[PDB]
Amino acid sequence: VRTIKVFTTVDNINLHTQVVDMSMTYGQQFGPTYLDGADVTKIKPHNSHEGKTFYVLPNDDTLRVEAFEYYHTTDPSFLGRYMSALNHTKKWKYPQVNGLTSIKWADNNSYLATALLTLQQIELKFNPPALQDAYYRARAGEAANFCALILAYCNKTVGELGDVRETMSYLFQHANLDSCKRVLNVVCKTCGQQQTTLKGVEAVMYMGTLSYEQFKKGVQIPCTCGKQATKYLVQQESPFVMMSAPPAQYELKHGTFTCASEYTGNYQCGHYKHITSKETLYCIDGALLTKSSEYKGPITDVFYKENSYTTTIK
Numbered sequence: 001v002r003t004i005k006v007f008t009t010v011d012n013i014n015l016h017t018q019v020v021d022m023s024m025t026y027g028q029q030f031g032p033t034y035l036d037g038a039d040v041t042k043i044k045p046h047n048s049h050e051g052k053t054f055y056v057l058p059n060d061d062t063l064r065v066e067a068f069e070y071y072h073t074t075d076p077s078f079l080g081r082y083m084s085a086l087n088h089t090k091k092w093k094y095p096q097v098n099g100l101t102s103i104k105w106a107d108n109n110s111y112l113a114t115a116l117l118t119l120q121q122i123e124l125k126f127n128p129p130a131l132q133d134a135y136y137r138a139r140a141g142e143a144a145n146f147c148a149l150i151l152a153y154c155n156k157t158v159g160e161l162g163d164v165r166e167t168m169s170y171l172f173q174h175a176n177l178d179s180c181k182r183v184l185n186v187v188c189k190t191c192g193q194q195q196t197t198l199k200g201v202e203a204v205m206y207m208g209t210l211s212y213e214q215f216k217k218g219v220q221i222p223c224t225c226g227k228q229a230t231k232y233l234v235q236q237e238s239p240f241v242m243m244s245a246p247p248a249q250y251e252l253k254h255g256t257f258t259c260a261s262e263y264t265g266n267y268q269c270g271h272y273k274h275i276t277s278k279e280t281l282y283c284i285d286g287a288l289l290t291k292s293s294e295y296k297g298p299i300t301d302v303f304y305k306e307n308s309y310t311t312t313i314k
């Protein structure tokens, strides 16, 4: 009976000492077992494993509670999906580009690089400690865990084609946007005027126009009476807003937005780049950086700063 000592965890915070039989697989002793993302369930302990930390699927109430406290999910597949993604994201390169942690292109990850760049430029606090901790580590240049968690929380695998707006939508549902409030007014010739209040994610996202200004002035929406009506923003309380539309040629002016998603090619299988407004316009394409004083190109998301806005419309 030869044995080594290892640590098991679900969160990489709470470590549990184990003595493992080197004649039995990790799986026979712990159930599903991972070493920095690699599935070692069907592998026997090696000497070099001595004192290393292994992730294991929770197999008692104590570990299921630790997993809920860290990830805010009880989904038994979550840990396996996180580890599957981490097994690739730990091999990606995360260069600093224009003071931001980017990702060198691999495994169709352009949407993920564009999201990661965006998240470093808007004010957001994540509810699950796993996401908040990884977000801090990503900002400091170590983004492998954050990217793997984003894939797991969005139900996406490495290589799957992803949409930045859909990814941000899922992440915002895991963020504290409770204080965020949007008041809209809908004006119809027939039904008259009606005001509604949105909160959380629905208060910071709009689909239909890239222009925050145009949203303030009013956009043409269908009324249930059949008529076109005008929707406009009455009041916005949020640290940012995200304006999205199907990709179209659009002019980005230095100092009038925070950052934007460029999308080139066909529906689903195209390529994202990230435009950021600094002292001039920077285009971050994974590891690649270009700058220009002007920009016109196919934009699908624009992010803007906000604190408190109240319309002057009567």
Ligand SMILES: Cc1ccc(NC(=O)NC(N)=O)cc1C(=O)N[C@H](C)c1cccc2ccccc12
Pocket (backbone or CB within 6 Å): 161, 162, 163, 166, 245, 246, 247, 263, 265, 266, 267, 268, 269, 270, 300
């Ligand atoms: C790249 C990508 C991955 C997954 C999705 N997902 C998707 O369509 N999911 C869905 N309908 O459930 C969309 C895109 C996508 O093409 N998004 C761009 C920004 C896009 C969004 C909306 C309308 C479009 C029309 C033409 C081309 C791209 C368009």
Ligand SMILES: [Cl-]
Pocket (backbone or CB within 6 Å): 008, 009, 010, 011, 012, 013, 014, 015, 063, 066
């Ligand atoms: Cl743990």
Ligand SMILES: [Cl-]
Pocket (backbone or CB within 6 Å): 072, 073
């Ligand atoms: Cl929750």
Ligand SMILES: [Cl-]
Pocket (backbone or CB within 6 Å): 072, 127, 128, 173, 174, 175
């Ligand atoms: Cl949550």
Ligand SMILES: [Zn+2]
Pocket (backbone or CB within 6 Å): 014, 015, 016, 062, 063, 066
């Ligand atoms: Zn414990």
Ligand SMILES: [Zn+2]
Pocket (backbone or CB within 6 Å): 072, 127, 128
């Ligand atoms: Zn939660």
Ligand SMILES: [Zn+2]
Pocket (backbone or CB within 6 Å): 088, 107, 158
């Ligand atoms: Zn890979």
Ligand SMILES: [Zn+2]
Pocket (backbone or CB within 6 Å): 188, 189, 190, 191, 192, 223, 224, 225, 226, 227, 229
């Ligand atoms: Zn009406």
